């Protein structure tokens, strides 16, 4: 439905939707911009990720409230209340899966294959790992292992490039490590790997801070603080 709008007007309207906190609209404008077929700039990649993060984050928070109520309904001595809680948790789960499939489809057609620079390729592979991770949070069937493996493979290819091509303070590298460590802790049942990766990533960034300008140091230390927040929570 965005095929008739100019690329620059979609970008302009995505920024207005972010100011208005209309994240569903922001995501549909950025999806229209990606489907123009040109590569994204750094600013444009961050608009795409902020839009879908916020849409899927609302769906994930609603799914967790519904899954909690359904788990309680399934405890001994709870009354039978019919199929409605499961049906509505399914409805929200299917719309969240559809948003993840939309993002994964943009990455596969054709953002990753045209991304040659480390900043773009690592960013898109982190997004691929993140949206397979959100699929894995709701997966309960025969494909669950393969969805977890798809998240792990995308994060591992992004880690391999980031280690070779970016400094240890780069904010995309740090946020990748942060999210891969949460994948290990919450999805792969590997809390020791999660804690090792967060510790190593924090320590290697600390040793590289002396190379930075004041503004770069603020960007990097913001994400380092997220890694230390998870280490505090997990240890």
């Amino acid at each position: 439905a965005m095929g008739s709008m100019e690329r620059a007007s979609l970008i302009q309207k995505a920024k207005l939707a972010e100011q208005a906190e209309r994240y569903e609209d922001m995501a549909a404008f950025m999806k229209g911009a990606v489907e123009k077929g040109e590569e994204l700039s750094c600013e444009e990649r961050n608009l795409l990720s902020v839009a879908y993060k916020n849409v899927v984050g609302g769906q994930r928070a609603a799914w967790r409230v519904l899954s909690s109520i359904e788990q309680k309904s399934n405890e001994e001595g709870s009354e039978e209340k019919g199929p409605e809680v499961r049906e509505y948790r399914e409805k929200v789960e299917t719309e969240l899966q559809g948003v993840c499939d939309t993002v994964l489809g943009l990455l596969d057609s054709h953002l990753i294959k045209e991304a040659g620079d480390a900043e773009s390729r690592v960013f898109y592979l982190k997004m691929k790992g993140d949206y397979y991770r959100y699929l894995a949070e709701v997966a309960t069937g025969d494909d669950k292992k393969r969805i977890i493996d798809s998240a792990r493979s995308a994060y591992q290819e992004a880690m391999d490039i980031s280690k070779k091509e970016m400094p240890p303070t780069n904010p995309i590298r740090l946020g990748l490590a942060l999210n891969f460590s949460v994948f290990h802790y919450e999805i792969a049942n590997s809390p020791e790997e999660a804690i090792s990766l967060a510790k190593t990533t924090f320590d290697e960034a600390m040793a590289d801070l002396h190379t930075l300008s004041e503004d770069s140091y603020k960007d990097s230390t913001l994400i380092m603080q997220l890694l230390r927040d998870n280490l505090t929570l997990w240890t």
């Binding site: 942060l178 994400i223 997220l226």
Partner: peptide
């Protein structure tokens, strides 16, 4: 406190 992601 929920764990952080970005």
């Amino acid at each position: 406190k929920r764990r952080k992601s970005v």
